[PDB]
Amino acid sequence: MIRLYPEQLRAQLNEGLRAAYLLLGNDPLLLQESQDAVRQVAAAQGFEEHHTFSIDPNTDWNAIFSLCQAMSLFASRQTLLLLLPENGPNAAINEQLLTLTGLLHDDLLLIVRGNKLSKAQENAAWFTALANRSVQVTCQTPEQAQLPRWVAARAKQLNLELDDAANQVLCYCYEGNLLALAQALERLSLLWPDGKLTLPRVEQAVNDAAHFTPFHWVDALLMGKSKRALHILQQLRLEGSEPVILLRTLQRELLLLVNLKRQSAHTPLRALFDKHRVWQNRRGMMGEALNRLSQTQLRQAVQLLTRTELTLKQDYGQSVWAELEGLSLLLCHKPLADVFIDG
Amino acid sequence: GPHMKFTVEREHLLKPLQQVSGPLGGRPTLPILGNLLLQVADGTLSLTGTDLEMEMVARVALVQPHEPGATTVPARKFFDICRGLPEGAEIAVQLEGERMLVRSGRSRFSLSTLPAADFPNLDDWQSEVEFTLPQATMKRLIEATQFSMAHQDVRYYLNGMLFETEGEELRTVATDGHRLAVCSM
Amino acid sequence: LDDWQSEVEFTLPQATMKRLIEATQFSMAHQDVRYYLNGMLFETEGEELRTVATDGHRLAVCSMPIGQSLPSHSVIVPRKGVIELMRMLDGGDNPLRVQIGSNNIRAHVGDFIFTSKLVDGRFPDYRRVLPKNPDKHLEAGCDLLKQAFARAAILSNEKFRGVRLYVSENQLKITANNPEQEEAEEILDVTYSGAEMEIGFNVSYVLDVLNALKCENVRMMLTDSVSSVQIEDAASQSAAYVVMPMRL
Amino acid sequence: GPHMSYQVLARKWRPQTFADVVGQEHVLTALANGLSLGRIHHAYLFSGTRGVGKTSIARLLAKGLNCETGITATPCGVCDNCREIEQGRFVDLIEIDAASRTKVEDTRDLLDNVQYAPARGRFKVYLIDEVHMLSRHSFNALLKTLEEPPEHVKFLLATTDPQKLPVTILSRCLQFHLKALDVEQIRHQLEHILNEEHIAHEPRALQLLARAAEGSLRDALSLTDQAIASGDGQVSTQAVSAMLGTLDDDQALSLVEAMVEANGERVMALINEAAARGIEWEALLVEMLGLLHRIAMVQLSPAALGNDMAAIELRMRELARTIPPTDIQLYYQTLLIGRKELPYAPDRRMGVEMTLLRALAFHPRM
Amino acid sequence: GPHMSYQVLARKWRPQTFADVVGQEHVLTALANGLSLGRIHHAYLFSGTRGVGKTSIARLLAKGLNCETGITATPCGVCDNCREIEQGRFVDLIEIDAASRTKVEDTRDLLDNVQYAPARGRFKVYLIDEVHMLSRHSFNALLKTLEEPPEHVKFLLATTDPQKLPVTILSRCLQFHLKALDVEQIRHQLEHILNEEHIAHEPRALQLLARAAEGSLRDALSLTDQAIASGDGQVSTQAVSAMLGTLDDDQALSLVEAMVEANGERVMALINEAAARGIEWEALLVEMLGLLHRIAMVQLSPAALGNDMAAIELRMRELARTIPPTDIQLYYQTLLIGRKELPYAPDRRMGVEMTLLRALAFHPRMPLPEPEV
Amino acid sequence: GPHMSYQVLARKWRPQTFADVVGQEHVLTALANGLSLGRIHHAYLFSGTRGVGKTSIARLLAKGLNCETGITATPCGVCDNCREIEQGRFVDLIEIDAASRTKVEDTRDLLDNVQYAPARGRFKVYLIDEVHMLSRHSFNALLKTLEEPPEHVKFLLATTDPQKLPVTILSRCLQFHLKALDVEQIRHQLEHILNEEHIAHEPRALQLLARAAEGSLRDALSLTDQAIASGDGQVSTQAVSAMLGTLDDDQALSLVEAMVEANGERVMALINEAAARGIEWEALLVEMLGLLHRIAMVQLSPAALGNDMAAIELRMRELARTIPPTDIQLYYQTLLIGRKELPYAPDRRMGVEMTLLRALAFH
DNA sequence: TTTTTTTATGTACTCGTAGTGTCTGC
DNA sequence: GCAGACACTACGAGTACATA
Ligand SMILES: Nc1ncnc2c1ncn2[C@@H]1O[C@H](COP(=O)(O)OP(=O)(O)O)[C@@H](O)[C@H]1O
Ligand SMILES: Nc1ncnc2c1ncn2[C@@H]1O[C@H](COP(=O)(O)OP(=O)(O)O)[C@@H](O)[C@H]1O
Ligand SMILES: Nc1ncnc2c1ncn2[C@@H]1O[C@H](COP(=O)(O)OP(=O)(O)O)[C@@H](O)[C@H]1O
Ligand code: BEF
Ligand code: BEF
Ligand code: BEF
Ligand SMILES: [Mg+2]
Ligand SMILES: [Mg+2]
Ligand SMILES: [Mg+2]
Ligand SMILES: [Zn+2]
Ligand SMILES: [Zn+2]
């Protein structure tokens, strides 16, 4: 219930165990390595038998068998590692968890692992009853701007030297995909145990395998950088989200931006953003975005976008995903189109 | 090349086929593992069936004339051929070229085989503890402590019996977890 | 649900209906484009309650005399109703009261009356389907033929369980092939005399027919390779079956 | 409970003999030549617009293939096999509601039992109707059976359009394109049917029903059955004219001349009057296009008007004299585009108003 | 003898020797050279449009491989194995109608049975037809076997759209593309078929059939059978022309020349003649568009005319020389708009009449005169 | 006749040692450095594209982890276990074709052999090729085996589409990513292969084969088999010229370059190529329109895209700036009108011909 | 820090479950 | 006998994918 960060969960792990542990937060790899650290700490301590249970609706609780009966040949305590569903559990499972805690033995440990829960799921009967002694901890992957420091810190922990150019190429190639980042770090360490990597082969042992959620796409398109936007779209290949999500995203911000430009003659852009708290990390990134445009520019953007909107859904076009390449690139160096398209 | 000659009866062939082809159900990784190895050596038939884990070998006396050789036959098809034939009928077998022909007087079948060289065998080893236990005693040992096994357990060794020996006595440990069992015969 | 007219009453042990359905159930259509082909045809005659089932390529007709005057009436009952009716048969001592209507079939068993909806169609004329000339006729032991056909079929083609009869003077030769070529040959001594002939046909169907009737000595009738085979028991003529050949 | 249920003309008068079929001379001649000469084929697909007779031709061919007389060009009609096919009981004619039975599962099921000999007939005809709604897997499943079927099985395909089929199947059957039936054939067939059915009819009413069906026996015959409900027992000219919404009056050319002279008020008044009277709008624009065509044709070559055109020549030739040749084609294109967009308009009257305003926008000076 | 059985031209005339093929060079030569040099690759996919020979070429190659004598590029038609594959249902050729075998539950069984040795001949030939219909799991299952099959197994994969296959399957096996045939080859094949059939034929009808076959031989053979049925057992230009709906009647060049010469009366006369002939109007418009297109192509380069169109070549050249390109484009656009508006015309004859009239009156060098003012 | 069965070059020239692997310096060096020392993760996931070496490299790890000498980055040459793995048969390596084994009723049994003793040689090691086809429950069984793997065993793993695996197993496995071969790598390897047996070769054929291989080495070997077949035991420029009808790609830019003038036979040759190739005419004209639109974009911006056609950044730019923008707009109008009316032409080839003729009619 | 928002229809595959044939030392 | 094994086969659901 404490709702702390794993940098402190390590501290509570070093001290006396605070009964059941619940580590949450959507994690690429940090959840698994935190689980591994918990496993090794427990193995050093009493609890050694890690029984893996997948918490899911429509799946009966075989954990009661461990809960009601104690181990007989090697007790050695034991730990129940629970895997939560990606949407959270239901009331039946939440109350059966409380029943299990009622069946808890002194050598039993409860570990609940999952993603962020809903408020009712968070404040269920089991969590409420365990709020007296259990702990809660959450973590999330670093952002784009927070990546270089994290990568450098991990490199310094692993006793391998990095460089600014190497960090740049890593944060470009592996942006938010820490599993790939960790594998690349291990590969660069094992390839050359010299301990000096500046830019000799870091690209040779690093591919383009990273996640890219749509919110950053306009962040490039608002500068109108042709090569950068084209490279971002090429990076989006092989993890290709269906076009509808990207289309919804850019229609959202373009409707917001056209409303902003309509109201620009009225109350200034900052106090207008006061209504448009879309948390674009300052609401000022949109402020520098709106600096480079024109009303005719917005017309040329919206015509192509709305033509695509019927180009993929009215007749089910197959090039429409590649059309996202077409629409984003043409806006980069189009101050205003002299009609000739006006879709 | 090889050409073996079977001359056998159903009653002395049904049970060995059952004992050698019982565990051979399902689809195995090598297709030869789904096959049953027939060997005709001296006046002896050796029927071999494997699952990469256990081998059943049945020996059948060949009182009637025979020819030595080695081949492999689809176990289910051969068993269903031997089964259902009239009681007391004689099965004769000749493996010609590629196919093996079975005959019961008024019936003839031609089954496809696989070369005997492809069939895997378990290498010889040294048997440390060799004994001739009474069959009933071993049956008691198994049954009195087999109800507790803990099949499908994470330990990946709790799933099997343990056998311990000392002097003229032995025990069978039923590694189960919350259950233990032992038997001293 | 209300009562119906054109309602003839039956009085028969459950064993009679069980024998009838078990005689003509394995050859009833299952999810076929011919919608009338599903279910069984129950036809009333002054002699028996004849029943007809067909897939278009297995025509099984059973005729158990009932001992009552029956106005001529032809009915088709769907697969579901037939299965349920067969499930409700047991005991063999209670008299089953079968009540036919224009659009429904009811039946009183013991103390309960159950009903089933009735397929709307015009079933084919089975008598024309039955061959018009039994010029080539043979008789053979039922269990011997059944055992021989099982032996041959164990190497038959999986998807198309197809064997071939070769009928010569007092001899039946069963030949079966399959992908991953395997040949099964079996010779039976039969009571046949006539023209030499070969005919390919499904073996699952014939094994099913022999399983259904299971008499002492069967006899089949047939003319030419394309001609369908009409199999019945040599003791009586109450049950007849028609199997359509493979190849052509 | 009438005779079965086909008290409707659409089912009662489907032909039972190649002699009884109307039109389709080329395909009937081809099928008769193939049947009699001995050149037979295992897969015919009949492609043509709706209500032309591809299903009927297919069933009649199925009759002709399995008549006890032999492989006869003209089916017996009285022999037992023809009677059974008429009843639908015939266990070798396997009709398929391919629009309903689309799953590849059922196609595979019906292909597994192709090797069986026919129960009673010579040929096991697989009549498939509405083939174009087979799932792509079903189309490709039919391939190796369509190409080389056994000696005894013959396929019949009856599709509304041929181009939706994969080019593989389209290249393994005889494509018989059923030519759409012209007005005279429809009129003669309808008159013969009505004389057989003993209900009085007027020739011009039959002409209307023929010209409104756009070449379809089923469509025209359904329209006649609709008129019989309206016109009590008789297909009378007045009743069918009111039902079909024909432009009996001369307001068509009146609003034509109002539109070409940019008289917006007059055009709107005529439209309001027509809507009040209860006009039909698609026929209005069809008449517009016809009148414009006649005006243009006599603008090029005089003395081209006929009957009613030759009577209203006093106005038509004046219009051809005053309207330049270039603007006539533009008016015609605008009117036909409006007719194209009539379905894509929430109100038909509003769609016609839109079309007329688009036309008047060519010269919107006043 | 002539063997009067009248059983489908397509099936009767499937190639049986290596030379009866219609004239695919780049694949027949490669296959023959591979079989001669001993390089018998274990898996290869034939692609190409419908009815070119890929399913036939596969059967010929299986015939060649499993011949009784040594591997010969040209199979014999006398040995037991060649006769058996000739008659179908051959012992060692497993022809798998993959469109009926798409479930992985059957491809797994196939790969289970692949190990057992064949009984006759040298190889067992898995002719998997319509490969592109296999379900994804079946393809992945086939992958490892295709990479390293046993010594005695060859996979004959044939399909129509190889791009549907997973790219790894394309990598595992060779790729032979069968080009759609030329008009000369297909016409020669039709001549051979009709001459051996002892059926009289006319050259114009054969040229029509070749043109309408769209470069796929089975289309031409089916059309030839349909024309044989259409006529009284003879192939005639009249029967083929009336059955195809082509406008060889009164050509179409008269109509286009009346267009460019702006004679409305000539256009009306030709339209009335066609209407009495009962021709379909959209085909007439398509013919006019094609004529305009060929005129433009010849105006760019005189060698654009086809040899099948060598009947009216002088007037074609003259019209190419006279009419400026812009007028040709204007005619093409007007007639194309007319064809687009045909379904929405009040009548097809009337719509085509007005399309002709519009393309006439807008002719710049000779427009329809304004009536009075 | 029935003699001299030259089996595929894909199978004959399959690498035997790490020195015979073309390209992929990173994977080779990483595993070489990892094999000398004992830090071996219990599961090695290999991923790449079609026909590169994932399976070959996995065979090499089975070669290395199991030898009489021991865990060696250097090859073994000949020693029983690794000798046995040159051919199919081998006792302590079992190659589960995961495509044929997807259900748990099979993969649970196969993984259940992990707790048996290893065969001759240490490191019971199995290669589950194409892992992306395992069922969800199969992946759960694999995860339960990976979380507590027996120390005496390891097992490799391969795939082609790594995105289908669960994140748990991907995070657990020490994934190596295998890169697509570059053109030079494939060209030199094919040169070596051809020189090895007996076949003469000219260089241009080999560049063409490498370009058409699209990067997969197995693809290059299949195409060299076809080239040898067509060329009658000699891969000369003519057989690969017959292949050139398939590998000829650059066609949409040349027609755009030839539209702005009357080049004579260029337009006829290009339309002949398009007709004999039969690519989508609608897509062809859409590519035309896109090229023309980016050209108009460059007219109003001297470097509007820059990354467009880097190989044609010395010819496309001339028509990107020299041609007046009015002519570009007129050409765009012509091509748009052609596309709008294309399906209604008698044939789409005729339609694209007419679009080209209209474009050439004006300027 | 919680934030918008495409379908119908079809085809496979794999995992439970459920129902049923068949038959084995019990 | 025979019920329980034991197999085997069919059906629904959940999921992944395709194509119009
Ligand atoms: N060629 C024809 N001859 C006679 N009647 C016809 C013809 N075509 C259509 N009909 C009439 O149309 C009705 C439906 O015909 P049908 O053959 O089902 O057309 P479709 O091709 O659209 O299925 C028939 O019942 C018949 O009255
Ligand atoms: N190359 C060819 N030579 C001769 N006939 C051919 C050829 N290609 C196709 N055909 C004709 O087409 C019929 C079917 O050809 P088929 O080989 O099935 O084409 P597909 O490649 O589409 O399966 C053959 O019976 C033959 O008459
Ligand atoms: N690194 C390599 N060295 C040598 N041959 C290779 C290499 N990569 C691929 N190949 C060739 O491609 C064929 C198939 O290779 P494979 O390793 O199965 O590719 P995949 O990664 O797609 O499973 C091999 O037989 C070999 O000829
Ligand atoms: F086109 Be029809 F109405 F079948
Ligand atoms: F008719 Be082919 F096989 F496309
Ligand atoms: F075998 Be590879 F993944 F193409
Ligand atoms: Mg119909
Ligand atoms: Mg084919
Ligand atoms: Mg691979
Ligand atoms: Zn031969
Ligand atoms: Zn070694």
Tab-separated table of N, CA, C and O and ligand atoms in Angstrom, chain D residues 9-15 20-24 49-57 129-130 178 181 189 193 217-218 221, ligand 1:
chain	number	residue	atom	x	y	z
D	9	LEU	N	-47.193	-15.325	-61.107
D	9	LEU	CA	-46.771	-15.576	-62.480
D	9	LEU	C	-45.275	-15.847	-62.577
D	9	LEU	O	-44.841	-16.583	-63.469
D	10	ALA	N	-44.476	-15.272	-61.676
D	10	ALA	CA	-43.027	-15.409	-61.764
D	10	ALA	C	-42.566	-16.853	-61.669
D	10	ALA	O	-41.531	-17.195	-62.248
D	11	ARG	N	-43.298	-17.703	-60.953
D	11	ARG	CA	-42.960	-19.115	-60.850
D	11	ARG	C	-43.777	-20.007	-61.765
D	11	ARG	O	-43.274	-21.040	-62.209
D	12	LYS	N	-45.023	-19.637	-62.054
D	12	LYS	CA	-45.889	-20.511	-62.834
D	12	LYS	C	-45.392	-20.657	-64.265
D	12	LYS	O	-45.465	-21.746	-64.844
D	13	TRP	N	-44.871	-19.581	-64.850
D	13	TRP	CA	-44.574	-19.549	-66.273
D	13	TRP	C	-43.087	-19.662	-66.580
D	13	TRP	O	-42.637	-19.143	-67.605
D	14	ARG	N	-42.319	-20.317	-65.725
D	14	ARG	CA	-40.952	-20.657	-66.095
D	14	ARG	C	-40.979	-21.780	-67.122
D	14	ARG	O	-41.703	-22.763	-66.938
D	15	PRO	N	-40.233	-21.668	-68.216
D	15	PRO	CA	-40.392	-22.626	-69.312
D	15	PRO	C	-39.990	-24.031	-68.899
D	15	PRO	O	-39.142	-24.230	-68.028
D	20	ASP	N	-40.175	-23.520	-75.365
D	20	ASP	CA	-40.972	-22.575	-74.595
D	20	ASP	C	-40.166	-21.383	-74.103
D	20	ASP	O	-40.721	-20.516	-73.423
D	21	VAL	N	-38.874	-21.325	-74.419
D	21	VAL	CA	-38.033	-20.243	-73.927
D	21	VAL	C	-38.050	-19.086	-74.922
D	21	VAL	O	-38.105	-19.284	-76.143
D	22	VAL	N	-38.027	-17.861	-74.401
D	22	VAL	CA	-38.137	-16.656	-75.217
D	22	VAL	C	-36.758	-16.032	-75.347
D	22	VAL	O	-36.002	-15.970	-74.371
D	23	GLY	N	-36.424	-15.591	-76.554
D	23	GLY	CA	-35.113	-15.029	-76.773
D	23	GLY	C	-34.041	-16.095	-76.630
D	23	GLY	O	-34.288	-17.295	-76.770
D	24	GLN	N	-32.827	-15.630	-76.342
D	24	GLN	CA	-31.697	-16.514	-76.074
D	24	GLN	C	-31.475	-17.491	-77.224
D	24	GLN	O	-31.143	-18.657	-77.015
D	49	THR	N	-27.730	-10.333	-66.989
D	49	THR	CA	-28.449	-9.524	-66.019
D	49	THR	C	-29.631	-10.297	-65.443
D	49	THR	O	-30.027	-11.349	-65.947
D	50	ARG	N	-30.190	-9.758	-64.366
D	50	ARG	CA	-31.205	-10.477	-63.612
D	50	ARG	C	-32.505	-10.605	-64.395
D	50	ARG	O	-32.890	-9.721	-65.163
D	51	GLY	N	-33.185	-11.729	-64.182
D	51	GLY	CA	-34.442	-12.005	-64.845
D	51	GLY	C	-34.333	-12.210	-66.340
D	51	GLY	O	-35.145	-11.680	-67.101
D	52	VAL	N	-33.342	-12.982	-66.779
D	52	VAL	CA	-33.161	-13.240	-68.201
D	52	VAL	C	-33.307	-14.731	-68.473
D	52	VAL	O	-33.687	-15.141	-69.575
D	53	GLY	N	-33.028	-15.555	-67.471
D	53	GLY	CA	-33.359	-16.959	-67.588
D	53	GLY	C	-32.212	-17.933	-67.436
D	53	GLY	O	-32.322	-19.083	-67.870
D	54	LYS	N	-31.111	-17.506	-66.820
D	54	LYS	CA	-29.963	-18.394	-66.701
D	54	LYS	C	-30.285	-19.593	-65.817
D	54	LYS	O	-29.892	-20.724	-66.124
D	55	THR	N	-31.026	-19.378	-64.729
D	55	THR	CA	-31.452	-20.512	-63.917
D	55	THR	C	-32.374	-21.429	-64.706
D	55	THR	O	-32.243	-22.658	-64.646
D	56	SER	N	-33.309	-20.851	-65.459
D	56	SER	CA	-34.245	-21.667	-66.222
D	56	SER	C	-33.533	-22.433	-67.327
D	56	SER	O	-33.816	-23.614	-67.556
D	57	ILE	N	-32.607	-21.778	-68.028
D	57	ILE	CA	-31.850	-22.478	-69.060
D	57	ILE	C	-31.030	-23.596	-68.440
D	57	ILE	O	-30.922	-24.689	-69.004
D	129	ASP	N	-26.261	-22.123	-58.376
D	129	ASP	CA	-26.866	-20.830	-58.655
D	129	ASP	C	-26.213	-19.767	-57.784
D	129	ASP	O	-25.820	-20.043	-56.649
D	130	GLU	N	-26.107	-18.551	-58.321
D	130	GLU	CA	-25.433	-17.445	-57.640
D	130	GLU	C	-24.010	-17.835	-57.254
D	130	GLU	O	-23.609	-17.751	-56.094
D	178	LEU	N	-26.074	-14.524	-71.601
D	178	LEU	CA	-27.486	-14.411	-71.937
D	178	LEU	C	-27.788	-12.984	-72.360
D	178	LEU	O	-27.764	-12.063	-71.540
D	181	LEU	N	-33.175	-9.266	-73.064
D	181	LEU	CA	-34.305	-9.337	-73.975
D	181	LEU	C	-34.855	-7.951	-74.279
D	181	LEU	O	-35.138	-7.158	-73.377
D	189	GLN	N	-44.037	-12.103	-75.305
D	189	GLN	CA	-44.133	-13.115	-74.261
D	189	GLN	C	-45.213	-12.762	-73.252
D	189	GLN	O	-45.971	-13.633	-72.813
D	193	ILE	N	-48.528	-14.930	-72.435
D	193	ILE	CA	-48.786	-15.389	-71.072
D	193	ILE	C	-50.170	-14.949	-70.619
D	193	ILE	O	-50.929	-15.733	-70.040
D	217	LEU	N	-37.583	-10.648	-68.023
D	217	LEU	CA	-38.862	-11.336	-67.895
D	217	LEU	C	-39.353	-11.321	-66.459
D	217	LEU	O	-40.540	-11.093	-66.209
D	218	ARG	N	-38.463	-11.580	-65.501
D	218	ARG	CA	-38.890	-11.604	-64.108
D	218	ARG	C	-39.355	-10.230	-63.651
D	218	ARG	O	-40.392	-10.110	-62.991
D	221	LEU	N	-42.663	-9.334	-65.447
D	221	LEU	CA	-43.743	-10.194	-64.998
D	221	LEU	C	-44.163	-9.840	-63.576
D	221	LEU	O	-45.358	-9.843	-63.254
I	1	LIG	N1	-35.821	-17.049	-71.596
I	1	LIG	C1	-36.977	-17.131	-70.916
I	1	LIG	N2	-38.072	-17.741	-71.378
I	1	LIG	C2	-39.227	-17.799	-70.682
I	1	LIG	N3	-39.408	-17.274	-69.471
I	1	LIG	C3	-38.372	-16.653	-68.910
I	1	LIG	C4	-37.091	-16.541	-69.602
I	1	LIG	N4	-36.252	-15.886	-68.815
I	1	LIG	C5	-36.941	-15.601	-67.695
I	1	LIG	N5	-38.194	-16.063	-67.759
I	1	LIG	C6	-39.214	-15.891	-66.716
I	1	LIG	O1	-38.571	-15.402	-65.550
I	1	LIG	C7	-38.813	-16.199	-64.420
I	1	LIG	C8	-37.513	-16.331	-63.649
I	1	LIG	O2	-36.528	-16.794	-64.559
I	1	LIG	P1	-35.050	-17.202	-64.070
I	1	LIG	O3	-34.655	-18.245	-65.089
I	1	LIG	O4	-35.022	-17.586	-62.604
I	1	LIG	O5	-34.088	-15.924	-64.276
I	1	LIG	P2	-32.620	-15.898	-63.640
I	1	LIG	O6	-31.641	-16.012	-64.754
I	1	LIG	O7	-32.386	-14.376	-63.251
I	1	LIG	O8	-32.521	-16.797	-62.373
I	1	LIG	C9	-39.176	-17.517	-65.022
I	1	LIG	O9	-40.044	-18.097	-64.063
I	1	LIG	C10	-39.840	-17.192	-66.342
I	1	LIG	O10	-41.193	-16.830	-66.132
